[PDB]
């Protein structure tokens, strides 16, 4: 009925799942394609025009309709390309709420799957990035420093708080993530271990009692860390952070999650992070501490 992710409540939306799925499949066909031509291109142009002018008064009759009714009209063949675009425009906030509730449910399931963790902090980036492209690389690098400096709880809250932005491109943390992402800025933190043998490679993976390893995967970045009581932490920017008392439990969980992603073993690699020069490295004039502040 309701799911709370790090202080934010996500409400279950009532809708016909089958009709919703039909609409989503159709929406992929109406998305703008520079390669399309002729009649398909015309339908795409008309759909986009309606979607951006979705409060055109000649469609006011749709304003009184329930979500399920709007979806039924969208998927019906007697609505033309323009009208479908308008309907997508009018449904856009509802569709975002539906997607957010599903992401929250996915995050709760991820937390439940971490049954040997002593703590899980959920910060699913798809919730707070508002459909913007993934920022998993700078999130992982920044959280590595947060974890080594006892600022991980603060940074988790700051990341999730981006969900509250009314202008994400003017949010200072998001802007810093985009900047840390680029120009090999992230590579400035670069200092025989694979997914199968991770559980038996603790003292090799983490040379020091406080260290972090960047995980590179297909179009994704994650992080594993050892922090001093000692905690072993897996941070997946798509979900959050799972804290374990035992390295072998953290590694078993990480391996289960890689198989869940269906990443081949040779596509997942491990890269030591070094924060020895974190005082000197400036991202748009801000060090990593100032970004976390």
Curated annotation (Swiss-Prot):
Q: Where in the cell is it found?
A: Secreted; Host cell membrane
**Miscellaneous information on this protein:** The active GTP-bound conformation of Rho is the preferred substrate for PaTox-induced glycosylation.
This protein's species is Photorhabdus asymbiotica subsp. asymbiotica (strain ATCC 43949 / 3105-77)
Tell me where on the tree of life, at the top rank, the source sits.
Bacteria
Q: What does this gene product do?
A: Toxin that acts on host cells by modifying Rho proteins by tyrosine GlcNAcylation and heterotrimeric G alpha proteins by deamidation.
Membrane spanning stretches: none
What protein am I looking at? Toxin PAU_02230
Domain remark from Swiss-Prot or TrEMBL: In the C-terminal region, contains two catalytic domains: a glycosyltransferase (PaToxG) and a deamidase domain (PaToxD). The N-terminal region contains a receptor-translocation domain necessary for toxin entry into the cytoplasm of host cell.
């Amino acid at each position: 009925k309701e799911i709370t992710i790090s202080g934010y409540k996500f409400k279950r939306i009532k809708y016909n799942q089958e009709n919703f799925d039909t609409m989503q499949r159709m929406a992929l066909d109406y998305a703008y394609n520079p390669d399309s031509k002729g009649k398909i291109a015309q339908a795409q142009q008309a759909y986009k025009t309606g979607k951006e002018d979705y409060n055109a008064p000649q469609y006011d009759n749709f304003n009184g309709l329930s979500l399920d009714k709007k979806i039924e009209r969208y998927i019906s063949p007697d609505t033309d390309a323009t009208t479908k675009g308008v309907l997508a425009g009018k449904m856009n906030e509802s569709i975002k709420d539906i997607n957010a509730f599903q992401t929250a449910k996915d995050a709760q399931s991820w937390k439940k799957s971490a049954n040997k963790a002593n703590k899980v902090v959920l910060t699913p980036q798809n919730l707070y990035l508002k459909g913007k492209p993934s920022e998993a690389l700078p999130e992982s690098v920044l959280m590595g420093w947060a974890l080594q400096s006892s600022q991980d709880a603060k940074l988790s809250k700051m990341l999730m708080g981006i969900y509250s932005s009314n202008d994400i491109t003017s949010n200072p943390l998001y802007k810093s993530l985009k900047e840390l992402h680029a120009n090999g800025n992230a590579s400035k933190f670069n200092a025989n271990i694979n997914v199968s043998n991770l559980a038996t490679s603790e003292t090799k993976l983490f040379p020091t009692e406080i260290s972090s390893v960047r995980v590179d995967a297909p179009k994704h970045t994650m992080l594993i860390s050892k922090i001093k009581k000692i905690k072993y932490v897996f941070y997946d920017p798509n979900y959050g952070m799972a804290y374990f008392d035992k390295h072998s439990d953290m590694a078993a969980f990480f391996q289960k999650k890689m198989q869940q992603y269906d990443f081949p073993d040779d596509s997942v690699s491990f890269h030591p992070l070094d924060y020895s020069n974190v005082s000197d490295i400036k991202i748009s004039g801000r060090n990593l501490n100032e970004i976390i502040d």
